[PDB]
C-alpha cells in the first residue's frame with residue numbers, strides 16, 4: 001500500500017486515491033506576500049488544560065498520541081472556525097535531514113518537522129462522520145526548527161524506544177499538549193485536506209507563524225523509528241511528508 005518510498009510514494013497516491021489531484025489539497029506553500037490579512041479573523045482559543053492522553057502508537061507512517069475525545073476535554077475554537085473542535089490525536093512529519101520534514105512551507109522554506117494537532121467538529125458527533133463534511137476537521141500545524149531542546153517534548157522522545165516498529169503501542173497518559181505550543185498564536189488559514197490517504201477534503205488548516213525549537217538529539221530519536229513491522233527488513237521512518245500542492249485559486253488568510 002501507500003507509503004513514502006520510490007514505488008508507493010506521494011507521486012503514486014492518485015492511482016488509489018484520485019482525490020489526490022483535487023481542488024483543495026494539502027500541504028501548500030505559504031506565500032507571505034500574497035496571504036491576505038483578514039481583520040475579521042478572531043484569535044484562536046485553545047483549551048487543553050483538561051486533555052487526557054491515553055496511548056502512543058506506531059501506525060507505519062508515523063506515531064500518534066491519542067487523546068480521549070468522548071467529551072469536550074481538549075478543544076479548539078475561535079479563529080476561522082465555527083463551533084467546537086475536539087482533539088483526537090497529534091502526530092509529526094519529519095525529514096532524514098534538518099533541511100526537510102515539514103509539509104507546509106513558508107516562502108518556499110522547509111522546516112525540520114511539522115506537528116499536526118487533529119480536531120473534529122463536535123456537531124458531527126464522531127470522527128468518522130466529520131470526515132464526510134467540508135468543515136469536518138481543523139488541523140493546527142506547528143513548525144519545528146532545530147535549536148534548543150523543547151522540555152515538553154521529551155516525554156514523547158523517551159517512549160519512542162517502545163513503539164519502534166509498525167503496530168506497537170504503549171500507554172501514554174498524563175501528557176499535556178500545552179507544552180508543544182509556541183508563545184504566539186498568530187496564524188495563516190486556508191481550506192485543505194488530510195496530507196495522507198485518503199486525502200479527504202474536509203480540513204480547515206491553521207498554521208502557526210512561530211516555529212517551536214527542538215534539539216538535534218530530539219529530532220534524531222524520531223529518525224530511529226521503523227516503517228516496518230517487527231521481524232521485517234528495517235526501513236527507517238524518515239521523510240514521511242507530502243510535497244506542496246497547487247493552491248488553485250484558494251486564498252490564504254492571515255490573522256496578522
Ligand SMILES: NCCOCCOCCNC(=O)c1ccc(S(N)(=O)=O)cc1
Pocket residue numbers: 116118128131139193194195196197198
Ligand atoms: N469512515 C471514514 C473514515 O475516514 C478515514 C479517515 O482517515 C483516518 C486516518 N487518518 C487521519 O486520521 C489523519 C488525520 C490527520 C492528517 S493530517 N496529516 O492532514 O493532519 C492525516 C490523516
Ligand SMILES: [Hg+2]
Pocket residue numbers: 130131132133134135136200201202203
Ligand atoms: Hg470532507
Ligand SMILES: [Zn+2]
Pocket residue numbers: 091092093116195
Ligand atoms: Zn499530519
